Scaffold this active site. Sequence first.
Site, PDB file in Angstrom:
ATOM      1  CG  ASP A 186      -1.949   0.943   1.337  1.00 51.36           C
ATOM      2  OD1 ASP A 186      -1.909   1.819   0.430  1.00 51.36           O
ATOM      3  OD2 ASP A 186      -2.800   0.904   2.258  1.00 51.36           O
ATOM      4  CB  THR A 187       2.419   3.251  -2.743  1.00 52.49           C
ATOM      5  OG1 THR A 187       1.255   3.454  -3.568  1.00 52.49           O
ATOM      6  CG2 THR A 187       3.241   2.137  -3.329  1.00 52.49           C
ATOM      7  N   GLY A 188       0.020   4.215  -0.572  1.00 51.51           N
ATOM      8  CA  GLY A 188      -0.735   5.309   0.000  1.00 51.51           C
ATOM      9  C   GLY A 188      -0.830   5.304   1.486  1.00 51.51           C
TER      10      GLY A 188
HETATM   11  C1  LIG Z   1      -9.202   5.754  -0.832  1.00 52.32           C
HETATM   12  C2  LIG Z   1     -10.102   4.544  -0.841  1.00 52.32           C
HETATM   13  C3  LIG Z   1     -10.574   4.336  -2.264  1.00 52.32           C
HETATM   14  C4  LIG Z   1     -11.284   4.685   0.075  1.00 52.32           C
HETATM   15  N1  LIG Z   1      -9.332   3.384  -0.429  1.00 52.32           N
HETATM   16  C5  LIG Z   1      -8.741   3.245   0.784  1.00 52.32           C
HETATM   17  O1  LIG Z   1      -8.688   4.138   1.613  1.00 52.32           O
HETATM   18  C6  LIG Z   1      -8.086   1.875   1.027  1.00 52.32           C
HETATM   19  C7  LIG Z   1      -8.967   1.079   1.928  1.00 52.32           C
HETATM   20  C8  LIG Z   1      -8.418  -0.268   2.294  1.00 52.32           C
HETATM   21  C9  LIG Z   1      -9.292  -1.048   3.268  1.00 52.32           C
HETATM   22  C10 LIG Z   1      -9.259  -0.521   4.685  1.00 52.32           C
HETATM   23  C11 LIG Z   1      -7.850  -0.445   5.200  1.00 52.32           C
HETATM   24  C12 LIG Z   1      -7.082   0.477   4.264  1.00 52.32           C
HETATM   25  C13 LIG Z   1      -7.013  -0.031   2.867  1.00 52.32           C
HETATM   26  C14 LIG Z   1      -6.159   0.737   1.943  1.00 52.32           C
HETATM   27  N2  LIG Z   1      -6.729   2.029   1.652  1.00 52.32           N
HETATM   28  C15 LIG Z   1      -5.811   2.791   0.847  1.00 52.32           C
HETATM   29  C16 LIG Z   1      -4.737   3.431   1.688  1.00 52.32           C
HETATM   30  O2  LIG Z   1      -3.562   3.654   0.918  1.00 52.32           O
HETATM   31  C17 LIG Z   1      -5.187   4.730   2.367  1.00 52.32           C
HETATM   32  C18 LIG Z   1      -5.275   5.918   1.413  1.00 52.32           C
HETATM   33  C19 LIG Z   1      -5.433   7.252   2.093  1.00 52.32           C
HETATM   34  C20 LIG Z   1      -4.370   8.103   2.214  1.00 52.32           C
HETATM   35  C21 LIG Z   1      -4.517   9.319   2.829  1.00 52.32           C
HETATM   36  C22 LIG Z   1      -5.736   9.706   3.294  1.00 52.32           C
HETATM   37  C23 LIG Z   1      -6.807   8.860   3.193  1.00 52.32           C
HETATM   38  C24 LIG Z   1      -6.651   7.636   2.615  1.00 52.32           C
HETATM   39  N3  LIG Z   1      -4.202   5.074   3.404  1.00 52.32           N
HETATM   40  C25 LIG Z   1      -4.523   5.103   4.695  1.00 52.32           C
HETATM   41  O3  LIG Z   1      -5.645   4.878   5.204  1.00 52.32           O
HETATM   42  C26 LIG Z   1      -3.393   5.476   5.652  1.00 52.32           C
HETATM   43  C27 LIG Z   1      -3.490   4.669   6.922  1.00 52.32           C
HETATM   44  C28 LIG Z   1      -2.350   5.050   7.767  1.00 52.32           C
HETATM   45  N4  LIG Z   1      -1.212   4.605   7.406  1.00 52.32           N
HETATM   46  O4  LIG Z   1      -2.324   5.772   8.774  1.00 52.32           O
HETATM   47  N5  LIG Z   1      -3.456   6.888   5.864  1.00 52.32           N
HETATM   48  C29 LIG Z   1      -2.438   7.732   5.603  1.00 52.32           C
HETATM   49  O5  LIG Z   1      -1.297   7.353   5.271  1.00 52.32           O
HETATM   50  C30 LIG Z   1      -2.834   9.145   5.769  1.00 52.32           C
HETATM   51  C31 LIG Z   1      -1.949  10.145   5.313  1.00 52.32           C
HETATM   52  C32 LIG Z   1      -2.412  11.462   5.417  1.00 52.32           C
HETATM   53  C33 LIG Z   1      -3.592  11.782   6.074  1.00 52.32           C
HETATM   54  C34 LIG Z   1      -4.041  13.079   6.208  1.00 52.32           C
HETATM   55  C35 LIG Z   1      -5.196  13.403   6.888  1.00 52.32           C
HETATM   56  C36 LIG Z   1      -5.977  12.362   7.320  1.00 52.32           C
HETATM   57  C37 LIG Z   1      -5.589  11.071   7.211  1.00 52.32           C
HETATM   58  C38 LIG Z   1      -4.401  10.746   6.545  1.00 52.32           C
HETATM   59  N6  LIG Z   1      -3.998   9.458   6.386  1.00 52.32           N
END
Ligand SMILES: CC(C)(C)NC(=O)[C@@H]1C[C@@H]2CCCC[C@@H]2CN1C[C@@H](O)[C@H](Cc1ccccc1)NC(=O)[C@H](CC(N)=O)NC(=O)c1ccc2ccccc2n1
Lengths: 99, 99
Positions: free
Chosen positions: A25-27
Amino acid sequence: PQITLWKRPLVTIKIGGQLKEALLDTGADDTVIEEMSLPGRWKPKMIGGVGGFIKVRQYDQIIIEIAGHKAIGTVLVGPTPVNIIGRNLLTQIGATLNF
Amino acid sequence: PQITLWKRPLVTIKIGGQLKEALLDTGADDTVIEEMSLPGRWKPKMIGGVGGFIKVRQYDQIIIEIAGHKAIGTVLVGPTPVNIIGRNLLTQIGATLNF
Ligand SMILES: CC(C)(C)NC(=O)[C@@H]1C[C@@H]2CCCC[C@@H]2CN1C[C@@H](O)[C@H](Cc1ccccc1)NC(=O)[C@H](CC(N)=O)NC(=O)c1ccc2ccccc2n1
Ligand code: NA
């Protein structure tokens, strides 16, 4: 390996003596795993993403094997819907995004 | 490019003639952007993130440039904290994860 993105990039990991599936998960800043026991001390943390925040336990200096490649780092444990390998460990196995 | 993961993989995108910053996210199935206006009709979608579900507006066949690479595809609009480029568009620009 080269992993395409036509499907979710799920791999097998070994952590805490257990085999699990996780998403590369690069995000994600962090690596977050479903509830399990890990050794050592921990501290509480809140992590966020889409939909808001969840409370997790932060364990430091945890070894994980990700698709055959070992790495050490912080692992967060809590009620994540999917196990995610975030950038803190992706860097350690030499992962890059290429286009 | 080859994008390493020591920092967030943030790139510039262009959508509706406007430049925005977005995250290249192998963990995201879909592309979701913060509130903006897009042309045409939309359809409803609920998407789940680490913290729960959000309601978004789905727009199809939207012209978007991602780090200079042109794509035309589905863009979701809603209360995401960060603009995310997910696999539906990473595959159009030929992205792979390599280690
Ligand atoms: C965007 C969407 C299409 C809804 N997909 C997803 O969100 C899927 C859902 C999957 C099932 C549940 C568990 C997570 C996975 C992977 N994710 C992708 C996944 O890459 C997701 C993308 C993202 C980034 C930033 C902000 C919001 C969302 N990252 C994350 O959820 C990680 C979790 C963490 N490490 O703390 N968040 C962050 O790295 C992160 C970075 C900046 C932020 C700024 C403000 C608020 C929140 C922030 N969260
Ligand atoms: Na520890």
